Each structure stands twice: as structure tokens, then as C-alpha cells.
């Protein structure tokens, strides 16, 4: 008796995605720029810290 | 209780980093 619950779940999920408010070009561009900026900040700050500290850890150790 | 602000916490973190750094330097220059 698993087929019917799975079918009902698939139907409900499909309906929900039909109703969901998907992003448009403007919203997707805004979120993409924000995510790129956050990734750049965190990742590049970490990369520069690691790059600075590799010679330093080589010296002190 | 002991109420601390953001700048005291930043100062404490920087001083702990510095203290560990000096510990490393002191070890390296006492092994010499």
C-alpha cells in the first residue's frame, strides 16, 4: 500500500511547484550577484589568509 | 556578571593569536 501515498505525494509536489512563485530574470540576477559577492568575500579572504600563513607556518615550524 | 563588549572580545582574540605566535617564536629561538 505504498504506491498510493507516493502518487499523492507526487501530485501534491507537482501542484505546489506549479503554485510556487519562481524567480524571474531580475530576481535571479540579483540573487546571483549577491551570492557571487558573498562567495568572493569569504573565499578570497580565506584564500589570502591561507596564502599569507603558509610561509609563516613554514618559518615558525 | 562580567559584562564584556565587542571590542574587548576582538582585543582578546588578537592577543591570544599574538601570544600563540610568540610561543612559537620563543620555541624556535630557544631550540637554537
Amino acid at each position: 500500500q505504498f504506491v498510493e501515498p507516493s502518487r499523492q505525494f507526487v501530485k501534491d509536489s507537482i501542484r505546489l511547484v506549479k503554485r510556487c512563485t519562481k524567480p524571474d530574470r531580475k530576481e535571479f540576477q540579483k540573487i546571483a550577484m549577491a551570492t557571487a559577492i558573498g562567495f568572493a568575500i569569504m573565499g578570497f579572504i580565506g584564500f589570502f589568509v591561507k596564502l599569507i600563513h603558509i610561509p609563516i607556518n613554514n618559518i615558525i615550524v | 556578571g562580567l559584562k564584556v563588549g565587542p571590542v574587548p572580545v576582538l582585543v582578546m582574540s588578537l592577543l591570544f593569536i599574538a601570544s600563540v605566535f610568540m610561543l612559537h617564536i620563543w620555541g624556535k629561538y630557544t631550540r637554537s
Partner: protein, 442 residues
Amino acid sequence: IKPFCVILPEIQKPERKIQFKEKVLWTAITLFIFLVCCQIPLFGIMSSDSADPFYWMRVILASNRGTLMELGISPIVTSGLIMQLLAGAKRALFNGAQKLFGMIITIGQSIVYVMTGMYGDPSEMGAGICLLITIQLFVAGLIVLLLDELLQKGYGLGSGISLFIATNICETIVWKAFSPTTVNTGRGMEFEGAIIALFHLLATRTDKVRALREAFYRQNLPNLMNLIATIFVFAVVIYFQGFRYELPIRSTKVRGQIGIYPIKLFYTSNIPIILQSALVSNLYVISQMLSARFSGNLLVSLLGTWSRAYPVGGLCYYLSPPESFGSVLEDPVHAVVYIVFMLGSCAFFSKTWIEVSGSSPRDIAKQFKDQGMVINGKRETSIYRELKKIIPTAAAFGGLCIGALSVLADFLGAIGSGTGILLAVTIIYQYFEIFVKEQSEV
């Protein structure tokens, strides 16, 4: 334990709201302190050549081996889980107790890390070196607690846990693209970073078109297919993170308050990933500790068959991403079980979390009744019914979609892993949500 709770530093609550510029300033200061602390090695480590016992928990604890951030965010997670369980089993003093037992775990976990064989033999260290390592880890955990409490009390954007996890994931992705490290196997110096390696190969190997193949489909080092897959998975996860069900709600208490209640598709943002990755990492660590000491036992062997130790048989193997498509062809049942476990575990964790963390349809209906919120086209009594129609399905399908995205990222070989990418994107979207929140408040 009231006297014991007061002997701890606590972050003073801001008198006035902290502006977004200062919030980002404190977030960047916290991130910089964490990043400096996870690259500074501990004093007294005899050797770091033995295999890492907790290599699989690093991503979820934001930990780096042999440095001041050895414990990472483990003290906070342990303290929070312990407090939640104790509250279930039965507020200012409660928070002080959370910090206190968090530090007790920090001292206790430091003793465990010392005597797991890593850092070298504890007996050869003596007492001064072990004590000083314990002090360093204790102060590092205290600093992590203080910065996390700063961020939560409101000088920063979000929790320290999310910031540190996302920062480590992003740093890993950038390092696998721009690293100056070069490895040589007789064919010459090849940069470990994909983009730098591409430029180096183009400049060196006679401008050959084979340099493009060797920089795009490279198998021994990070390649540009992996970076392209990472960017594509970022795009897909962003697009699916923008999904939301927009309930038109009004207010009957204070009139003129029409609005939108967003029910995101990713109802539990990264909780499925966090719980599932934590479960798998703990299972891997337990399996390593069992098969490394109590080897040969049937139960231990079924728990995991490690064979760099990647499982090749047992439950821990069947919970692992397929290493190569050849493994998928030769072991189709492994791929099927992996996909099924991803999707099902993510969906189950999502629905369980909406039932636990007070985001269930009944809880949301109670919140609506407290504030007088009423759906625009529905009766005051028909609020829980619509929430029952939407929220459970939203949570289950959001968990399923997040698991599917993790599977896709693993199959595409994206730098960062499926979990790391989903965690990073969801945390950055949380920060973006905060930003647009103060922007809309203006």
C-alpha cells in the same frame, strides 16, 4: 549551578540597532579572526603525520587539523544539543549554563583529541606540553563562543556556525581554483588550482590545444569541468532557493496590513543537509574507530569496510557517493541505494524538523491566530487547513529537492561536494535575506 553560570564573559546587548555596515564590519572581523586562527598551528604538536581520526567531520564543524581551530564549532553544537535535550527532559541563567557546559565539553573534547594518537604520543609529551595544548584549545573554544555570541546578540549578520561553515566551504572552492601549490609527477610542475593551471599550461605547452584538454578534463588535480559544474550547481541551487509560495495574508487586529507570507520550497533551508551530513560523518568516524581497533568483528565489518580511507563495503559504503561512473556500472545497487538514501533521508529530516523546531502547520496557525493574521481568500477557521495543505508538502519536497541537488553536485564532480555547495549557497542566501530585510525596513 547559578554561581557557576555567572563566572563567564557574555556579550553586551547593543543599546541601539546596529546598522548593516557595522554588522558586516563585525561579521568580517569575526571571519578574519576565525580564518587566522584556523591557520595558526598549536604549540607543542610533536607530529601530524598520522591519519586524521575526524577528517569527515571537518566540513560540518568548520575544523582544521593541528591549528587553533581544531575543535571548530563543535563546542557550540554540543552545548546546543545538550541544552535542547535537557530542556525536552526538563532564560538568562539558561544561556549562561549553555556556555558553561559548552566550555566543559571544550576541556573534555581537548583531552579526547590529545589522546587519540594525533599530535604525537601523549606520554612522550609529558605534562607541560599536554596542559599547554589543552589551554590553547580551551582559549580557542572560548574565543569561538564569544564571537558566536557576539554575532547572535546582534553585532553581526548571522550565527557563527553558519558563517564559519560557509567560509570554510568557500575557501576550499577558491583554493581548488587559485592555489599556487604545484605538484610534479615527472611531467613537470602542474598548479593545483584549476585556473592557474590553465594559464600555466597555455603559456608553457607551446600554446597547444592539448593543453586545453589537460586543463579541462584533468583527473589528477582540480580541473575546469569541476569549476563549471560548481558554478552550474550554484545557479541551480540559487534558482530553487528563490522558489516560494506566497500566501496573501491580511490582519484583523490592526487593519490595513495586507502582506505576503512566503513559504519557501526549501522550508528547512539547510537543516536536511546539516543533519544528514552530521549523521554520515559521525557514522564514518565511528566506523573508522571500530575497524581500526576492533577489526574482524562481523558487526564492525558490516558497519564499514574502509580501504586516504574510502569505504568499499557495508552501510558506510552504501551511504557514500559513487567515486566513479565505473563503480555505478559495476555496482548499480550502490548508486540506487545512495540516491534513495539521499532523497529519503533529506525529506524525512525536513518533515521531522518542521515538526520539532516549531514550524509545523499547527504552530504556524497558532502564530497566525496570535497576530490575527488571516489568509486573504480563506476564513479565519480555514487557516490551519491551507497550512496543512502547503507546509508539509513544501518541507518534504524541499528536502527531496535539496537531496537531489546534492546528488547532482556529487555526480557532476563539483568542487565543494554536494553538501558543501548546498550549505554555502543556503548560508549566503540567509545573509542576502537579512540584507534585503534591512533594505525593506528603510
